[PDB]
């Protein structure tokens, strides 16, 4: 029945999902975790401060050793920071000044860096020559690359401005598998600890699960009402939290396939940049645009703490694998360590 | 006390010195952003030099760095904040687009988009009107009233250019902070680059006076 039948097949079988989700919502998260004792006020102090960068810092990533981190800024310089002793491990001059993402490989030998250019270059940190040079150029994207996170020494996954996501092989430098589900502009990407599934969010207020092996959205979540650019997995991998531009952080589970919590405050009207969980997942940290970074409880949803140590906007923050400390970066070219 | 950390911090000072030299060098160079619809290829080829295109050239002992972002073809909102610290924006529009399809209406929407942008609230805009030769020939045959129902005046380039100048800058809901530097694109060189050179130094002088407290 021409194009009319597809909309009928789309309007219907969409009510089935919401009817299933509504029937499955026996109890809300806030209605069961009431017996959990409150976390209380959380106070963090700037243990270390980094001022090497000379431009607005866009993204950061923590290393496996929980000591080395990668900081990116529009000045065209990649800095490997020794958070323990504050010195700079390496300085990588980037061909493209604009950068929106940076990743540190789990092995630590390689790093990722890309921005407005459709290429997020990969640099080897353990070269025989002792310098840092590009290894592969993933130039198969069309829109601006927003986030590419390292999967392994030979596999990486990228998110670009177009409604596509790509998984590359380092040896060949080609799109092994591609994803095309989002209808907007993918901003942030997160990886499950098991390294088999990953979830990403876009400007269409939807977060979609994808499998690196197969290659197709297994689930989608449309609990938001504005552009989302902050999304990270739970430590256990069965849930994830998503930050949007309407000062709302929503936790989505991988079992009920529906939103399970909405962190929001009346006094906050600014957007969110990056979201990162703790080691145990009890504490959720979100980076807001009002020159301030907030701490929320994953269960009770209370204002555990406020980190307002940055003059400009907190564009990114990260938590180490062991959760020892939290590293945050903003547009003031400064990085702070909170623990 | 330290054993090998002394060499580690020594590397940091050597690294930090390099960024400070690189940062100072980057500060000496000035950055400009190109915005337009369709019209801009001739502009970048007058200012003698996939994703975005970055062009570097020097004029009168001043390092000019230009950014071509019109080929992104993506959502402008999510990356326009990267150009917050740009000195000036080179907005190039085609005057002949009034006879093609509505095109100039999109340019005004684009011009209104970045004139009122929060990140661009302190950045001057340089307006370029291309197709000067094309406009001269085709303005006598077609009426400018096609895209300007309210306009009523003589069919003449002098009146036609003035109304375009009246309409464009009118879209600047910040007549104090911004400064629109309109110009007419000429096929011959040594004049378009002169206007761009004179444009930036005006912004820096105003920016310097703003820091000094004069403006």
């Amino acid at each position: 029945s021409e194009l009319d039948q597809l909309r009928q097949e789309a309007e219907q079988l969409k009510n089935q999902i919401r009817d299933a989700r509504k029937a499955c919502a026996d109890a809300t998260l806030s209605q069961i975790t009431n017996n959990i004792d409150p976390v209380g006020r959380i106070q963090m102090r700037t243990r270390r401060t980094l001022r090497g960068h000379l431009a607005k810092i866009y993204a950061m990533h923590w290393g496996t050793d929980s000591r080395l981190l990668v900081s990116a800024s529009q000045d065209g310089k990649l800095i490997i920071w020794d958070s323990y002793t504050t010195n700079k491990v390496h300085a990588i001059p980037l061909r493209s000044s604009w950068v929106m993402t940076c990743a540190y490989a789990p092995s630590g030998n390689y790093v990722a860096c890309g921005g407005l250019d459709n290429i997020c270059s990969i640099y080897n940190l353990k070269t025989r020559e002792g310098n840092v040079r590009v290894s592969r150029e993933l130039a198969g994207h069309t829109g601006y690359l927003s986030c590419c996170r390292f999967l392994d020494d030979n596999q990486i996954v990228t998110s670009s401005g177009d409604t596509t996501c790509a998984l590359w092989d380092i040896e060949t430098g080609q799109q092994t598998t591609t994803f095309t589900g989002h209808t907007g502009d993918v901003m942030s990407l997160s990886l499950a600890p098991d390294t088999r599934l990953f979830v990403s969010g876009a400007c269409d207020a939807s977060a979609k699960l994808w499998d690196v092996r197969e290659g197709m959205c297994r689930q989608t979540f449309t609990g938001h009402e504005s552009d989302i650019n902050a999304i990270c997995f739970f430590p256990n991998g069965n849930a994830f939290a998503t930050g949007s531009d309407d000062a709302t952080c929503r936790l989505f589970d991988l079992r009920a396939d529906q939103e399970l919590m909405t962190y929001s405050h009346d006094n906050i009207i600014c957007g969110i940049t990056s979201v990162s969980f703790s080691k145990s997942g009890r504490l959720l940290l979100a980076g807001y645009d009002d020159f301030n970074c907030n701490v929320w409880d994953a269960l009770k949803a209370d204002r555990a703490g406020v980190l307002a140590g940055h003059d400009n906007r907190v564009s990114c923050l990260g938590v180490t694998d062991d959760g020892m400390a939290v590293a945050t970066g903003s547009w003031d070219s400064f990085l702070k360590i909170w623990n | 006390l330290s054993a090998e950390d002394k060499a580690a911090v020594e590397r940091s000072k050597m690294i930090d010195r390099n960024l400070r030299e690189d940062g100072e060098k980057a500060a000496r160079e000035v950055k400009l952003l190109l915005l337009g619809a369709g019209g801009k290829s001739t502009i970048v080829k007058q200012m003698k030099i996939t994703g975005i295109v970055e062009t570097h050239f020097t004029f009168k002992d001043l390092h000019f760095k230009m950014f071509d972002v019109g080929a992104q073809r993506s959502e402008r909102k999510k990356w326009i904040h990267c150009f917050e610290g740009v000195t000036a924006i080179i907005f190039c529009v085609a005057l002949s687009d009034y006879d093609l399809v509505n095109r100039m209406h999109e340019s005004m929407k684009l011009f209104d988009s970045i004139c009122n942008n929060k990140w661009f609230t302190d950045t001057s805009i340089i307006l370029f009107l291309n197709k000067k030769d094309l406009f001269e020939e085709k303005i006598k045959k077609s009426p400018l009233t096609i895209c300007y129902p309210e306009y009523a005046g003589s069919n003449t380039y002098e009146e036609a250019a003035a109304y375009i100048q009246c309409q464009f800058e009118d879209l600047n809901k910040r007549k104090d902070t911004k400064e629109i530097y309109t110009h007419f694109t000429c096929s011959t060189d040594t004049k378009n680059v002169q206007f761009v050179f004179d444009a930036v130094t005006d912004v820096i002088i105003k920016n310097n006076l703003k820091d000094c407290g004069l403006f």
Partner: single-chain antibody
Amino acid sequence: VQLVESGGGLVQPGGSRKLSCSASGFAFSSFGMHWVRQAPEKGLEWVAYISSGSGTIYYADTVKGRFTISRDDPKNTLFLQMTSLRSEDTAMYYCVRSIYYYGSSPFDFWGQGTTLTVSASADIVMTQATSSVPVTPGESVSISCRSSKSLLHSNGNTYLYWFLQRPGQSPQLLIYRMSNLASGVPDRFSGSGSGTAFTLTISRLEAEDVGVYYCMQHLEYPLTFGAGTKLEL
């Protein structure tokens, strides 16, 4: 990646001589340099060190002030000028490139070296257990070394390095910081110790594993050397 040294030979005592080392295949400017010497009958001995940026320059106690070391990054050449050298200065001289950061591999490459012949405290001594030990292929051999001062630094990193010197070949780096292995080193080599007594174990020794074992130190800066253990097939 090559380190070609020149300027050695026979020099009358009390004279002046300049040794030039040319570095290729790697960033010479970003790498600090070390000049060391090995006596024909004794082990290796540290001589001098220059930083990557020519900021910090250090010398051995025996050759302090006497020697001069400089680097030319645009020419990519390391110049070591020695004046008024005595009869005890005759040795084979080596140049080692080292970079210092977290997870780095200092002393990873070793120069070919040049012979130099002449016509006739506050330091920690590595008390090596023995100077030689017989080995056989297919067997695991463990060597032991001792230091007069504990190398357990306050940061939790122990600064001891192991070096393999094949007969007639430049020394190679086996284990750095007593806990990790350099690139190209077979996984059979392992290190252990409590910060004062150290043990290097090799499993399934091969013909290419023969050579001399040398232990270094980095907790302080005398840069002393051990006697060395000779392996017999």
